[model samples]
Structures are given as C-alpha cells and as structure tokens.
Target chain A: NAMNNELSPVALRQMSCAAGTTQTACTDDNALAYYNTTKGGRFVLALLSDLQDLKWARFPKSDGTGTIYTELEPPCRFVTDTPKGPKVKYLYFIKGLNNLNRGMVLGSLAATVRLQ
Target chain B: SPVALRQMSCAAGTTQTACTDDNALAYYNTTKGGRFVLALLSDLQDLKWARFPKSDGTGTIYTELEPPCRFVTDTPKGPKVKYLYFIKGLNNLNRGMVLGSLAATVRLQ
Candidate 1:
C-alpha cells in the first residue's frame, strides 16, 4: 500500500481536464466538446486515465465557472477517514503539476479523499 | 515545458446534436432572424437556457420554424448556437460551486 504522503500514479491522473467533441489540438476541421452528465461520470475519468496517465477526458459545462468535479490518480484515492471528523482531503496542487506550474499557467488539480 | 491544454466541454455549440428534445429545453430568440435574444427561465427561479443573436446588417434570413440544436458550421460565417446548458433549475441546483459556472471551457480543436 502507498503511504499517505507518497505521490502515486493514480494521483497524477486525477488532476486532468477534458477536451469535449474536439480533438486534443484546436483544429478547426475537427473541434469537438463532450458534454458532462451524471450518467457517464465514472467512465469520464476512466477514459482519460485509460488512454494516457493524465489524459483529459471530462468536459467543462457551459453555464459558468465553478468547482464541478473531482480528479483521482493512482496511489491517491478519494477516501474518508473514520477517526477524523469529516475530513475531505486530497493531494491537489492547484498551481503546480507533477512538473511545475509557473505564472499564468494553470496548475494540476488533485482529488481530495474526505467528506465535508 | 511542453504543456498540454485541453478544451472545455460546457462551451457553446459544443453539444448541439441532442439539443432539440423537449426535455432539453432550450432558450428561444425573438425579433425575426436579423437580431434577437434567447432565454429559458422557469418558476423555479433558474435560467436554464440562454444565448444571443447572430447577424450582420445585410439580409433578413428568417427561419420558418425553430431550428433543432446542433453543433455545426456550414458556412465560413453564419448564425449558429453559441451557448447551451443541461441544468435543471438554475439557482435550485445544489451540486456545489464547481457545477455552477466553473464548467469546462471548450477549445475548437
């Protein structure tokens, strides 16, 4: 079992975004965006991580900007602690990815394993 | 570093195919084809559907009937669905902040 502080493969995959309808590249010929719903939530995350470790799978909704979903990576699981009173914790580096998220660069977001 | 930026899915005109269903409930526009406004609100106090008019001062291209929502661009420049949503009641939604406006941003790839 991986330790709490250790970064695992799963942890990396959780911090991914999505490219709906369109392909990875923004090519006019083939711009697609996949809509997100409760039906295909699990598969959404699985599809991305399945293709590449941290591949983008889910799509952002068109309503507005808000915290919509959670990302999960290997070794990094979304869990809840019994002893702790409602702890919602995940290893999320908002301004940094496995490498480095510099200025103007959006950082990788990880999944927190806790219940609030 | 070679960074990868994925597009958002909740962007306008992204999921156009499944927009015509009555349950889909879309915001309709008024004032003919040249220019108009579209909005879908309910007694639930939620703005379900909304979008703006698309046109350039030239001709009066009126639609016989409301067009089915679809993500397509036949002409280099033409009117199309610029925005879309799949929420039930606007303010009534309780999925938290993320499910609100902070949706996916679509990059035309």
Candidate 2:
C-alpha cells in the first residue's frame, strides 16, 4: 500500500500542502480553491481523529460541486471517530481507475493533507 | 417532450441478447445508426440490477458484477419487470469539454 501511495501521479502533485501546520478557512463551494487542483479521478478522503471537539462543515453533496456521482468535483469530506482526539487525523487525495471498469476501483494515492 | 419508461430482459450470461417481448432488451429515441454511447452499470437490488448503455446496443460496461442481474421497480404503469441495470445519465461532452445536457432513466419491477 505504501508503494502504491507514493507511485500515484495524483499524490505526487499535491505533496506540497502541509496539513495541521497551516489552517485555512474552508467553506462550501469554494473550499477547493484553497487547495491545489485535484487530478481527474482523484479525491481527498478525510477522517476526523477527534470525535468530540472537531467538526466538519458543508459536507460534500451529490447535487453540487461535491457530487459523488462522478470524481470530477472538489475533494469530498466525511468524518468518523477514532481513539485519538481533536486531530484532523488523516487526509489523502486518491485516484481511481478508468471509466471502463465503472471507475470505482481506486488506483493510487494522489496526495496527503494534514488538517489543523 | 414526453417521458417514456422501458423494461427489458436478456439471457443470464456475461453478454446476453435482449428478449423478444414488448419491453424486451432495448430503449427508444436513443442516438443510434452511427453514434453510440457506452453502457455502464448504475444500480442494483435483490437479484435485479440496472445498467445504462451510452448509446444503444453498445453492450454493457460495469465496475463490478455481471449480467443476469435482476431489477424491480413499481410505477403508475404497474409492477415493472427488467433484468438489466438502469442508468442516470450525467452530462454531455464535446471532446473533453462540456457541450450540453443528457438524460436517461430506468425502473425495474
């Protein structure tokens, strides 16, 4: 999995963004403007390590920019709890296979972001 | 414009031909003759499944699963019956750029 992570063309491009070190105001529709352009067939999967303190706003929807129907929109966000606290936990922009195979089979890691 | 619903059935196989019934294995008013859209699997339930062919008779494309998948849906037209997956057409493109709009629908019973 580690090898596949680094080898992904999508991840290689977005490696410059530091996660928790820098906090930016991310809002609906425009949240993606703060981040680098996501590659085709790529998305950011996020996990909130802290269950109680941290919260997510303007979660992705299938209707607008974050439409889950296709991989062509802004990075998506979904939160779940772990034993850890108040940490953005982990975030990775990942890519998927070609449209021929229905495009659900993830290909490789695009990049990782450290959230504050 | 009027909305029409169609139900079709095919043999139980990886690539089965459509049946000879009234709602058998085809849709109407699609771009055929020369142009074609690729079919892709979109939904499923129980023994039923739905698929969308980009055009008509281009065969089926799926992310996972195979044919003979079943689909069921109820409509004002009564209990619809189909053996193929349905599609929700997303958009239209001229080359890689957005050209216009597209629409497709299928309900199984």
Candidate 3:
C-alpha cells in the first residue's frame, strides 16, 4: 500500500526506541528487523507510505534479499502531527549497535516498501 | 485510574534494588493501550511475564522516563507500604489499566 495508514507518532516512537520487543545477537534497535522486515518495522511500514523511502536506499543481498542501511547525518527525523500540531519527536534507526560483530543473529533484509 | 510508575531503579548492582508503582490509575505512554509486560527477577521460564505485558509485550512502548526523579521508599510508615520489585524499564502501558503488584524481571515483560 501507500502512506494511506501512516503509523501514529506513538508507534513510530515506540519502534525507534527499541521497546516492546526482544533480541539476542543484536541490541534493541538492531533486533527490530523482526518487526521491520519480518514484523515490527515491516508491519508498520506496510501500513503506511510505500510502506515508505530510499536516499535512503535498501541495498540488496545475494539471496535476492536486501540490506537497507543508511545512517542519516541528522538521522531520519520521525515526528508527530496530532491535533496540537507538529514538533520534533524521534530518530529513525539505520544500523543498530552491532559493532565488533558481537551479536547472535547477523543479517539484514530486503525491504518491502519505501515512501520516497 | 491507572498504575503510576512513581520510582524505578536498580536495587544494588543490577542484581537488586528499588522500584515502585501503586494501584493509582492513569494512561501511561498512551500508545499501545497502556499494556505492560512484567516478570519476577527470580522466574526463569520461557516467557514468564507474558501475562500483563508492556503494550503488545512484543511491540513498541513509547515512554519518557520522568527526568531525574527519585523518592523515598515507604518502609516503616503508617500506611504500611509494599515494595517487592526493581524495575529498570518494563516496556510500556499506553492504554488505561490498573497496575497490580509488579516485580523486577529486568526486560522480562
């Protein structure tokens, strides 16, 4: 679909902060792939734009999968637009704290959507 | 009314400490309907605290820890308080739910 059912600010913030979920090899943010590609991040996006982006690109993997990693300079700014108006809220995660390759599950996914 | 997480922190060295939330009622981080995830630091089950999970217990929990705030743990006072858990951060409860007796299981919930 498209940005028809954009995630509410709360959902966005929740995913960004790495709450409501669990992981092993990866830190909180890194483990989001389950939600993003297979679950969280992915589920939410499919409910919104493209499921939303590119600049911002999803690098593909060898097995026809993808590894979308883009560390925004200022970081992808995900904000809010509720009744009271809009204001800065959260940051979009790119690669999680998987440095030193000290995690359990190690891999990325082929994104299924993108807004821009 | 809803459970209010008034105080949260480690007991000693991440192995034990103080954390509180009473029968008070209020919508915490109104995102996933104030759902929450809880567990006892002693239980070693598969998904022990899967009961009253935080939000979806496996989703996202939007919250803002009350800035540098810490209070006295009611001990030998008049009302006779109850303290039993050490919460670091138990996901989120965005909806409206009454907080029951909570325990510390780290991120169990």
Candidate 4:
C-alpha cells in the first residue's frame, strides 16, 4: 500500500483529526506538533512510518465484545546493538479507547528513543 | 488545498447536543467526558490522539495518553457520561487547538 509520510491534510482528516472528536490533532488542528519547532515532535513525524505495515482489525476482548486493535508484533518493540551494550526502544501498549471497538494504543516515544 | 471542512454533526450549544457533536469520531470513545483537572503537568508529557486511516476504509486514532477525557459523572453506581471537548463553533474557537493542547502542550491538568 502507498504510504503517507507527510500525512497530507486530507489524509490527516480522514484519520479524524481536524474536526469532530474522535481525536482531534492535525496540522490544521494540533497533533502535527510532533513536527514542531523544537524538533521534539519527531515522534509525531515518525508516527505514520512507525505504523507503516500495521493493520487494524477487530480484536475480541473480555466476553464476546471486540476492539479495533492493531498488531504490534516484533520490531514494533525491538532491540538494537549500541555502544552502551544491547538496548531497546519501543512502544508501550496504552489502553484508553472507551468504545466497544476499544484499542490499546501508543505512548510517548522519541524518534531515536523507543522507550526505556 | 481548496475550500474544505464538513458540516458539524450538531450546532454547538451548552447541552448534551454539543457533547454529542464534539465526540463524533470515525471511531468513537463513547466513554465521553474527562476527569476534572486540579493542576497542570509539563507539556513534554503531552501527547495528542490523532486519527489514522485504515486501509480498510475505516479509521483509528492513537496517542501516548490515558483517560478521563471521558468519564462517568455519578461514579460507580451508574453516573451519566460527559466530555471535555472544547469544540469550535461552540465553546471553543477551534476544537483541535484545545484537544491538541491536551495532546501536545496542555499535558492533562
């Protein structure tokens, strides 16, 4: 599938950012601050790529209910060889979606630092 | 880009109507509202929930955030649900601006 590295406005709104309330954050909106002035928003820039090959599907959770969750397989939480020895930086599954189609999502991260 | 934007689901107001309009999502958080804030935190910890289109045509949103942005009103027994949407065309000049504040700068108070 084609990738949207720049996450054009049309693409961003399709994700539900600019308006409504399913999570308002876009360039016209706000979330793109990941591509902010201080460069600290790199994680915001890395977002789409971080989820490039990712897919979202109905994941059954407690009882017969389901949540629209994605696969965070391996490299999504990977390790790397570094001067400080082997280290890892990855996404921590964060659950906050309140709908029956609930999904466990991501947490704070650095473009270079996945996590501790 | 050319002329853009969509019709608001409902006209902005102070009632649940405004609430419904604000929480409207490609995928919803039905669990509307939030935990009342007593103080503020550093913006660095701020993270905004952004929607991403699924190849399937549906959409999904994500962020390094936790909840109470939507919460129960009465608590425990069966309280009413509420939201913290600072919606534009209503209580907000721009909805994304405040939600983005929570996501990137405001850092959940």
Candidate 5:
C-alpha cells in the first residue's frame, strides 16, 4: 500500500508506562529500548493520553545531541481524589532522522504523570 | 486569558513566505490563544473581505483567485474581495484538540 511504502524507511513503537486508572507514574524499559535504536532519526511523536492529563514533556536522551527538545508541554487540570485517582493512558510516536538538521521526532524514552 | 488575534496584508500576488509586511504581521503564544488571518484586496476602495482561518492543521493556505474563492460582501464600493492563505504556528500541546488552533490572517495586494 502507499501508506506502508511511505513508512518503509521508518520504524515505530509504543510505550505503556502507566495505566489510565492508577495515579502512579508509568515507564516501560522495553519501550525505551526500542527508541534507543532510532536515536537521531526523524519521526512524528503522536500522543493520545486518557482524560487529556498525561504529559510527554521531553525527548529521550539517546544520542545526547539534545538538538531537539520538548517544544510543547501537555495540558492538565485539578482532579478530586475520591476513592481512586486519575488513570493514565498514553501512546507515543518514535522514529529515526530526517532533513531537519536539529533532528525531528521519531519517538521513544519514558515518563510518569498524575490525574485529578 | 482569552486568545489574541494577529493579521497581515501582503501585495496583490505575494507568496505567503515572500510577504514582508511586518505591519500586517501579528504574534501570540499558542499556550494562550493566538490566531492568524491573512487577506488580500485587489484595490484600495474595495470593501474589506476575503480571509481564511489559519487554525486548520492543513499547513499553509496559498492564494488562488480562481474557482474556490470565498465571497465577502457587495457594496457601492463594489464587491470587495481577494484571494486568501492560512498558516498556523507550533502548538503548545501535542493533543489533537482545536483549542490549540490559534487563528492568524494575512492580506495580499
């Protein structure tokens, strides 16, 4: 397919760090490992956080180039901690490199979050 | 705080990137609310019309006086109209919500 051919030169991976139910931080070592291979690669970091409270504030420090950093900070709001706290659901985009000298977002690394 | 609005006016057929009218330019933080709107006018006496909301993620909106132009208004000053283009800034949040859709406008001619 045309879409498959476009992505042929790129790699992809997802990281399940925290559950959308608990308030604990989420980080998957395996997820970070996958991103390590594509450090300095160009890619898009598409995110889908449950309740819109999750955050992916920075790029993983794989190559230490630090050319590209988290340009956008995710949003959050106050939550009432009744019996259970906010749940975290997340999906991240990872890839290799592109024409962008500073590098583009492919994906990767890890982090934690809380919901209200 | 409420979002801010920025606008600009370029020459009759100036490309979006080639437009250097700083007076037509505006700026605002996406974290707040900033929108850009670009418009064009064929002549000075024409009614102020023809604009496109740059808030759409469709990237840059180029100018085209043909087929799909938007109709603004018709007055004694004649139906003032112009082609339009739209562009957006980097969103403060990666989420897909339109809240980050800060609007911006520009004008040519």
Candidate 6:
C-alpha cells in the first residue's frame, strides 16, 4: 500500500515565499511559493499584487483541468516548481483585491490529493 | 531585408517627425509589445468631426496601411487633425502619447 502523505495543518501554515517569487505591485514580476514540511498531501501558496489603472498577466498551466479550476484573468497558474528542486502539484490561486487599488493575497490551502 | 527590424517613415515629406521607422515599434510602459501607428485625417483633434463612431457602441472603425496612409478626421475643409498614437518614452511601449500627426515614424525589427 502506498503511504498516504499526511501533513499537520500547523506544519502547512509555516510555508514561506521561497526566494525569487516576491510580490511586485507597480512592477512586473513572477509569483512563486515553497513548502517547509515534507509530509505533504497537498500544498499551495498565492502571492498577489494589484495595480491602479489596469493590470494584465499570463501564466502557463500544465494540467488540462483549466476550465473546472481556474481564475478569470488569473494572476498565476495552479501548479508550480518548488524550492526543494522538485515539481510540486498544488492549486495556487491569486485571491484578494484589497482596498480596491492596493491588492493583497489571501494566502493558500493544502487539501489532500484524494480521488473522490 | 528580414522585415527591416527598424524603419520609421512618414507621409508629408520624410520630415522625420522626431521618429520615422515604418516597422519600429514601442513598448508599453516598461515591458509590452504590439502597438499601432495611426495618422490623423480629421481636422479636429478628437473624434467629434468625423462623426463616425455610433453612440450605441456598434459603430466600426476601419484602418488600412498603404500609400497615402492616413486617418481621415472629420472637420471643415478636409477635417480637423490632432491626436496620433505612437511608441514613445523609455524602452517600453506603455509610454504612449497623443500628438499631432505632422510627421512621425518608428523602426524596430
């Protein structure tokens, strides 16, 4: 039997912004995320920044599940490369458009990759 | 010719309106591409004279690139001409401005 990857909700909360993928509001920059604990079932982190007039962005997604689970004019993609030198499969979203002009990220959630 | 990566030309008389590259393009702000170069044919600055666009948002604006390339503005005695769109400021194209189409060109391949 394959060992079920289990992570405590507390451990998942300790994820960091990795290194390069920092939020750049007025400027153009790539968004990134990283995981701390290895006992992973699923993990995701959303980094966002808002603009004044109008802002546009493009993100590439590998999984074909686009329509079912995708953000409109989404800031970034669902899956991304992790800092541990491995491809992490998680659904990261660009949530939160705070104070209208000044945007903010609502963070992420790591649900188990279960086959329902 | 490889599409002459850069060439800004103008109508009037090759006056080199600060820029004159037919293929030269501008970037939006700091990083963007795919802008346009349009000539003002109307006598007036804004789109009030041409009286083309419909208030119902269903009117179509046509544009063609060729000899006598121009934007016919609606005005008296050949229509008023004022605003023109082109690439300007910084290496980015976002820095666009509306100026008189006396003569202007941008070359970028």
Clash counts for all predictions: 41, 25, 33, 12, 36, 41
lDDT of 3: 0.23
lDDT of 4 by residue, A52-110 (tens): 23322222233445433332222244554567786644322212322211110221121
Using TM-score as the measure, name the better of candidate 1 and candidate 2: 2
Instruction: Kindly indicate the candidate among 2 and 3 with the higher lDDT.
Output: 2
DockQ of 4: 0.01
Q: lDDT per residue, candidate 2, A13-91, as tens digits?
A: 2222222211232223322211212444334332222122222323344245662321222233433232474333222
Q: Provide the lDDT at B2 for model 3.
A: 17
Q: State chain A's TM-score for model 4.
A: 0.21
- In model 1 chain B, which range of ten residues has the least summed lDDT? B93-102
Query: In what order do the candidates fall by lDDT, top score first?
Result: 5, 2, 1, 4, 6, 3
- Candidate 3, which segments miss by more than 4 Å at Cα? A1-77, A81-84, A87-90, A98-116, B1-34, B37-109
Clashes of 3: 33
Candidate 2 lDDT by residue in tens digits, B28-69: 222335323222222222222233444467675422222333
Best by TM-score: 2
Write down the RMSD of candidate 5 (Cα, Å). Answer: 16.0
The residue-by-residue lDDT of candidate 3 on B43-83, one tens digit each, is: 11111111122434574222222211111222333332221
| Chain B TM, every candidate | 0.19, 0.27, 0.20, 0.19, 0.29, 0.18
Candidate 1 structure quality by residue, lDDT tens digits, B38-69: 22221222222333223464532221112221
Candidate 2, true inter-chain contacts retained: 0.00
lDDT over C-alpha atoms for residue B24 of model 4: 33
Docking class of 1: incorrect
lDDT of 4 by residue, B1-109 (tens): 0111122222122232222223332212212241111111111111123223343667532222222244223445555443443221222212232333233322221
Report the lDDT tens digits of candidate 5 across residue range A18-52. Answer: 32222233333212212212445633344434445
Model number with the top lDDT: 5
Model 1, A8-108: lDDT tens digits are 11111233454222244322211112222333342232222112223122345435454243242432223345474644322222211222211111111
**Chain B TM for prediction 3:** 0.20
Q: How much is the TM-score of the A chain of model 3?
A: 0.22
Query: Candidate 5, DockQ to 2 decimals?
Result: 0.02
